Design a protein around this ligand. Structure first.
Ligand SMILES: *[C@@H]1C(=O)C(O)=C(C)C(=O)[C@H]1O
Ligand SMILES: [Ca+2]
Ligand SMILES: [Ca+2]
Length: 419
């Protein structure tokens, strides 16, 4: 398993160019199955799931090629089944179901786990398509959807916010007969970006970004060009890299409005921040950060995806801070590892009490969550000595060339292969 051997302490500063959000590129790529004409999706990161999605689409009869853009021609999509071998590594493959049934009246996606009484993440997608008039069933290892003719617009009330089901319902709704209204819709910028992509193809959607999205079905969608938005978590991750090392940095190709709560919190930590249309700068002016208090909640509130990074910030800040998770109350895998690096923190239920220390010490660490893993790399950058972060493939799957980006900021880092 590959590892990153990092040597500190180092000050992280300079510039970084933010990649597009894999979490917006993915739903957009499947939404492209609706387009009857060629489409160009710009600013698509080069990550495993993107390649996995490209192969899946190709297997459906889509002409697919990529570079920084991914070009799609779904004009001749003629196979409506996504097989086990092509979906096995990716849960998001369920997003092919909605577009397929909406445009072709049929679709089937290989699903692990067979039949079950207990509620599963997949069901939300299923209930959404059922509300839209599709008949669904699980058989011979597949979830199979069909509808005679067109789907039918409906007033949907979501019991709990779900990014995945919102995408499925909104995407499929664009070709439904009549109007669809999604109450308590997911508000994430990724939903906004996906809605905007559908619109650039000719769909009628309003409300994206609020708790209610309204869609007006249309006969068909055309083609076009759309640029995926910047990855806000990668952005926050680099902002934190400078914030914790007394550095200064500028993130190019960013989008400030997707990070309101994160910026406000970085200012509370003592960061001098400026922003423009598509860039963000942060300057610590050589100072240690001030501990802050954080509460994760649904977007636009503070994101759980920035929680490990901010935990790290508090752990090297002046003062005591409290991190509270209301989205995933058990996502604190990084704490014990940062404690082995010299930190001081108590985990109390769904919160972490942090007592910032002066300097961390290198150690061998590891976390299986992408964000926590990136946080351990950042900690290694500022810790005294050598740190070895193991199982970095989690990072490789969600961050584009994080190694190069950090090296350009002054990091002393190396990938170690083999054993
Ligand atoms: C059980 C099953 O066999 C089936 O066809 C459906 C619709 C399910 O949700 C499974 O849990
Ligand atoms: Ca079931
Ligand atoms: Ca069945």
């Amino acid at each position: 398993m590959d590892k990153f051997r990092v040597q500190g302490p180092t000050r992280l500063q300079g510039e970084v160019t933010i990649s597009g959000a894999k979490n917006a590129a993915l739903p957009i790529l499947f939404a492209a199955l609706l387009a009857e004409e060629p489409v160009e999706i710009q600013n698509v990161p080069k990550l495993k799931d993107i390649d996995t999605t490209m192969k899946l689409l190709t297997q459906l009869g889509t002409k697919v090629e990529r570079x920084g853009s991914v070009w799609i021609d779904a004009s001749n999509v003629n196979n409506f089944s996504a097989p086990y071998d092509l979906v096995k590594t990716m849960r998001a493959s369920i997003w092919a179901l909605g577009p397929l049934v909406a445009r072709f009246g049929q679709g089937q996606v290989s699903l692990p786990g067979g039949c079950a009484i207990g509620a599963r993440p997949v069901d939300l997608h299923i209930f959404g398509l059922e509300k839209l008039g599709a008949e669904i069933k699980l058989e011979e290892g597949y979830v199979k959807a069909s509808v005679n003719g067109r789907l039918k617009g409906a007033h949907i009330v979501m019991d709990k916010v779900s990014v995945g089901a919102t995408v499925t319902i909104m995407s499929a709704a664009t070709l439904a007969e009549g109007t669809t209204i999604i109450e308590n819709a997911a508000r994430e910028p990724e939903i906004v970006d996906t809605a905007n992509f559908l619109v650039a193809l000719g769909a009628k959607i309003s409300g994206q970004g609020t708790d209610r999205i309204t869609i007006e079905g249309v006969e068909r969608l055309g083609g076009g060009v759309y640029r995926v938005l910047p990855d806000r978590i990668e952005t926050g991750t680099f902002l934190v890299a400078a914030a914790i090392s007394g550095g200064k940095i500028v993130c190019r190709n960013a989008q400030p409005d997707t990070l309101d709560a994160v910026l406000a919190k970085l200012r509370e930590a003592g960061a001098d921040i400026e922003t423009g249309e598509d860039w963000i700068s942060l300057d610590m002016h050589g100072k240690r950060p001030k501990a802050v208090t954080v509460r994760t909640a649904p977007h636009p509130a503070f994101p759980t995806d920035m929680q490990a990074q901010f935990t790290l910030l508090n752990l090297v800040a002046e003062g005591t801070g409290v991190i509270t998770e209301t989205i995933f109350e058990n996502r604190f895998m990084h704490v014990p590892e940062l404690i082995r690096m010299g930190a001081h923190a108590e985990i109390e239920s769904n919160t972490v009490i942090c007592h910032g220390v002066e300097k961390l010490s290198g150690a061998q660490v590891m976390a299986t969550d992408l964000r926590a893993s990136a946080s351990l790399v950042l900690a290694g950058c500022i810790a005294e000595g050598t740190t070895v972060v193991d199982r970095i493939y989690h990072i490789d799957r969600g961050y584009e060339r994080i190694e190069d980006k950090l090296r350009a900021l002054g990091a002393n880092i190396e990938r170690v292969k083999g054993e």
